[PDB]
Amino acid sequence: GKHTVPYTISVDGITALHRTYFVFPENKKVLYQEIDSKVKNELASQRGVTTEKINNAQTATYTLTLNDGNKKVVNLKKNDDAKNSIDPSTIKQIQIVVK
Numbered sequence: 001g002k003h004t005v006p007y008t009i010s011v012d013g014i015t016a017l018h019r020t021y022f023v024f025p026e027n028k029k030v031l032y033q034e035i036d037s038k039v040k041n042e043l044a045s046q047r048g049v050t051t052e053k054i055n056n057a058q059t060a061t062y063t064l065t066l067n068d069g070n071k072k073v074v075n076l077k078k079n080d081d082a083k084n085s086i087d088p089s090t091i092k093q094i095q096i097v098v099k
């Protein structure tokens with residue numbers, strides 16, 4: 001019913017909280033913008049990394065590792081694929097990185 005996706009946050013080479021997960025309703029497609037939103041939300045609440053902080057960072061991205069082992073990197077500063085859709089059920093893990 002609910003798809004859990006473990007995620008980690010790295011900022012300036014450091015990581016804080018452990019075993020944190022995003023939750024998505026099973027097999028219901030979402031726009032990447034929705035995942036972008038959940039990601040920015042946590043960056044802000046857990047690391048105090050606001051939208052303004054993302055825009056001024058050298059690099060700000062999140063890497064999706066899909067169930068089949070492949071990966072897809074999304075740029076948080078400007079996500080062209082913000083319109084594209086994806087089945088969250090295909091996502092195994094998310095690695096958020098900002099520097």
Ligand SMILES: [Zn+2]
Pocket residue numbers: 002003004026089
């Ligand atoms: Zn699932």
Ligand SMILES: [Zn+2]
Pocket residue numbers: 066068070
């Ligand atoms: Zn695939």
